[PDB]
Design a binder for these strands. Sequence first.
RNA 1: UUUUUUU
Length: 698
Amino acid sequence: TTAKQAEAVEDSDINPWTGQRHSERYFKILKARRKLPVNKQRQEFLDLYHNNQILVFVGETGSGKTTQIPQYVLYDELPHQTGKLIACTQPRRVAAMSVAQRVADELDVKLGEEVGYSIRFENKTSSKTLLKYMTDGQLLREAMHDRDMSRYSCIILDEAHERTLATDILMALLKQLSERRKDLKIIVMSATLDAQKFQSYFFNAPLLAVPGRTHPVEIFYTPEAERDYVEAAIRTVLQIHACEPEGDILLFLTGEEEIEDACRRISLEVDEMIRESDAGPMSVYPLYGTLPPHQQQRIFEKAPQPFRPGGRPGRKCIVATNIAETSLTIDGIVYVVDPGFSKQKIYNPRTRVESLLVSPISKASAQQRAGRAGRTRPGKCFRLYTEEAFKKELIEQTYPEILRSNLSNTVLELKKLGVEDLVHFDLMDPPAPETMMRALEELNYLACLDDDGELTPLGNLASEFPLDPALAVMLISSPEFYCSNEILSITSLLSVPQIWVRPANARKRADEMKAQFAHPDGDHLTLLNAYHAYKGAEARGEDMKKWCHEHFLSYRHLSSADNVRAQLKKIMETHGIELVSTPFHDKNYYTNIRRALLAGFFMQVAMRESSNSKVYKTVKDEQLVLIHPSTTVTTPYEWVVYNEFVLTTKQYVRTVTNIRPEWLLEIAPVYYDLSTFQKGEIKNALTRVAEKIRRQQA
RNA sequence: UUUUUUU
Ligand SMILES: Nc1ncnc2c1ncn2[C@@H]1O[C@H](COP(=O)(O)OP(=O)(O)O)[C@@H](O)[C@H]1O
Ligand SMILES: C[As](C)(=O)[O-]
Ligand code: BEF
Ligand SMILES: [Mg+2]
């Protein structure tokens, strides 16, 4: 129960957790572990952990927080052996997997037994699991079926500074839960926190600060600002490989296509360096969220050897988003290149629209990016901006996601978690009252909430799916339209990135191949055609990787959609949601699917402004939009339903489907009662249709 | 005319 007693157990020739002998690797790792900064203050942690329920833990990047603290807790529970687990949340999936593997080696156990991890589509845990690393979202999902979270004796919220939606909800639940359960220890960790703020939020909780740093990270700034950060990044990477001593490179960029372009350009230049300038080999790895876990994990591959002894060193270059910004320890990395940008989510309360925008990062993020080096060996960080641009122009801390998001989903889960009063629900940063009210009214229109704001059985059922309420309600109500199987597939396809591939090289052949899946009356149906063909060739036994290539479809996203569909189907079967289909050659086969979409998306409908106008007008809001250029429908109806809203240098609605206005009055009579509609051509048009429908009464 | 993340 004290530090020196626990250390004696760690030195034992036999492993307490397996009943088998400790390997020789274990003892060398253990020797290196005890040189970490957090190890110096282990006792100071222990007596604070004992005397307090909630604790804030701060230490530099490299300190030992994520890997050592849960082990400290585990060894503290050692003398009496509980069934309850120790939880450690990570904001990223790659983080949860990588750290769990590391700790598994540190405890000399195999991954998935004593030390495991849990993320979406992968629950690598067992009945022997004592320590579980997971994503904050995964834990939040677990809490929606276990409010008290009885499975856990200790929950460690890591990298809390990121302030994701899950993190904020979790902090609020855990704070209120800590009054209910005194047998629940809670620890909040980060290298870049606002300590006093977090302390004050958790009932003036104690703070433990570890001062030390394992290895130094030298930080360099540009003398003047550069306008093309992608060009400056590529230039920096190539300069390092050409002149600097050995050491792998971590480069941060903003998005997938930017990264894929960068990797191509880096590889091209390196290849010419290698052939004509005696440069060493360089492997380039892309890293972003939509990559499968197997390809993400390839960043831990060893850098290539030099071509010849005494030759220029071979090295590795990881080109990543900010999923590699925190938590990860990539051994071999010496150089970090920080252009200072990330794609961030912004929200407009007025226009109901959320969008992505490439923006400057915060000082905390910048510090974190640099912290990916200086972990195993001294590091260098090349910040592609000015030192005074760092101190004056960069925000101290990125704004919380809950202040930058649509809260329709967030609110629905809060009700499911059993939050009695939304107004007095103590969130660390409370969102704007209008954002909150508008979420309540959307959930009200979807019949997920009462008029008094209490959960509907429908709403309770909607919170079971990894989907936004509108998408969930569409899926749940689909059997009423006799096409639940098809909506299930469409729902899955809407939950993944665009399956369509259109390289600059052959855009016109890509559109040629897309044209054979094209359905005149909507993009949703076009997706369904592409999916059926995909599954058709799959069952036929053809290899899909090539099949997707000749058809210009993303095998990556199509495969990802199948994972979603399998998960969603299992949920539907669990809660007795009927799975049915209409025979393909039936006349109403397509119309049923189109009408089914409206069951959840009746609030995302736009009318054509005039006779020969390409401008559409959203209902109620009356926003002026254009149909996204990547649309299948050649000649669109005066009434369409759209799935998403996008903002390029023009305002677009995306993935639209031609509908008939009489469907709107049929499926959503409350939202489309015309007393609510006010002084509009949309109300005029809708009024005429209602009268026509009444006439058809005869 | 790309999905930054996460369920
Ligand atoms: N996968 C790994 N390979 C080699 N060393 C590692 C690995 N993970 C962690 N370490 C060592 O343990 C230290 C602590 O890592 P970690 O607990 O993740 O730090 P923190 O959570 O404070 O950032 C690292 O700085 C590094 O020295
Ligand atoms: C806008 As900047 C990250 O170059 O200071
Ligand atoms: F602060 Be550690 F790098 F997660
Ligand atoms: Mg960490």
